[PDB]
Design a protein around this ligand. Structure first.
Ligand code: VNL
Length: 363
């Protein structure tokens, strides 16, 4: 009738609290900048904290759909959370907007899922190609022991070995409270040319702290990976050991576009911190909802919304992006960046751009 509800399910507490914080903030910023009304509907955002626990995600999604009667569910800080909600999204015909989780297969788990974040494969193929072409011969991998870490590993390995690289060791660490010290100790003794590192948003600072504590910034071992470890939400808290880390990713707070300059300044002014790649996922996720509603002339049923979302394209602070009409997954530039100091702060400075990269996990 007059209102349209978005059930926002994100980790506000626990290990992935920094992801939920950014997504909640970015959506608040979006509404502050665009208003809360579209095609005669007042948008209400209902926040629920699942603490990145899939059992909570499922119960909260049921409550939002059945009790609160939401038109869309959104967020999903980790892959298991997105997967937990998928059956309910399908049964209730409610779009599920994935603003964080990055495992390739997620969009295949419900015809109502649409993603505005990334897949690990998008970034992992690019850094794999780059490492091989740049004389890196022997690499040890460290990856979070769950779905997106496995994607990161597989796609990096594929491209890096195809280019003549060799993986010397593969090490996996738990999602919950990882201890990086053992892998890092191994590195100090084994001295590969580089370490490829995937850890989720929120953990890169801890990784870099143990890296610097074990003295590895003086070892000549390069750090490479997808951009998650060099999370812009965390870059400000890191020391000089992070200088020179090379990552591929879809977003940098240093992206030089007019829209990004405006977004970063607005976010900093409102929240007092730099947005990271999770904030952008949220910003674009809510934009997608607004634009869909506009396109349907305010029709709020799931089928109408999904139909409008497919093939949608717009400029994001990260660059031009679109929803693939075939897969419902995000198509976006992937940049390669080097951590450099500008005006006293560390930034992921983009030096390479690959245009409109479709998820390699579905191509
Ligand atoms: C919370 O941070 C992340 C989560 C995931 C996921 O679970 O699919 C992938 C990449 C990330 O940076």
């Amino acid at each position: 009738e007059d209102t349209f509800k978005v059930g926002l399910i994100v980790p506000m507490t626990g290990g992935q609290a920094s992801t939920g914080k950014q997504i909640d903030n970015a959506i608040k910023l979006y509404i502050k900048k665009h208003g809360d009304t579209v095609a005669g509907k007042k948008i209400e955002v209902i926040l629920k904290d699942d603490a990145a626990i899939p059992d909570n995600t499922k119960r909260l999604a049921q409550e939002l759909i059945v009790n609160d009667k939401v038109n869309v569910i959104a967020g999903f800080g980790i892959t298991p959370a997105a997967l937990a909600a998928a059956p309910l999204a399908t049964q209730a015909k409610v779009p599920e907007i994935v603003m964080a989780a990055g495992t390739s297969i997620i969009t295949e788990r419900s015809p109502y899922i649409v993603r505005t974040s990334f897949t690990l494969a998008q970034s992992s193929i690019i850094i794999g190609d780059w490492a091989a072409k740049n004389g890196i011969k022997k690499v040890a991998t460290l990856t979070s022991d769950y779905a997106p870490g496995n994607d990161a590993l597989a796609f990096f390995k594929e491209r890096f070995t195809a280019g003549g690289g060799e993986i010397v060791e593969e090490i996996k660490v738990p999602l919950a409270n990882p201890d990086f010290a053992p892998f890092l100790q191994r590195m100090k003794d084994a001295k590969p040319d580089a370490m490829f590192v995937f850890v989720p948003a929120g953990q890169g600072g801890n990784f870099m702290k143990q890296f610097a504590e074990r003295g590895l910034d003086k070892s000549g071992i390069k750090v490479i990976g997808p951009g998650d470890v060099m999370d812009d939400d965390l870059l400000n808290s890191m020391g000089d050991a992070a200088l020179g880390v090379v990552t591929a990713h879809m977003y940098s707070a240093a992206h030089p576009s007019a829209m990004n300059k405006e977004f970063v300044a607005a976010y900093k002014k409102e929240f007092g911190q730099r947005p990271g790649f999770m904030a952008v996922g949220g910003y674009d996720g809510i934009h997608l909802v607004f634009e869909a509603l506009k396109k349907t002339g305010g029709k709020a049923d799931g089928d109408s919304l999904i139909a409008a979302m497919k093939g949608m394209k717009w400029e994001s602070p990260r660059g031009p992006i679109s929803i693939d009409p075939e897969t419902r997954d995000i198509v976006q530039n992937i940049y390669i960046r080097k951590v450099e100091k500008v005006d006293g702060e560390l930034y992921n400075i983009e030096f390479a751009k690959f245009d409109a990269v479709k998820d390699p996990g579905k191509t």
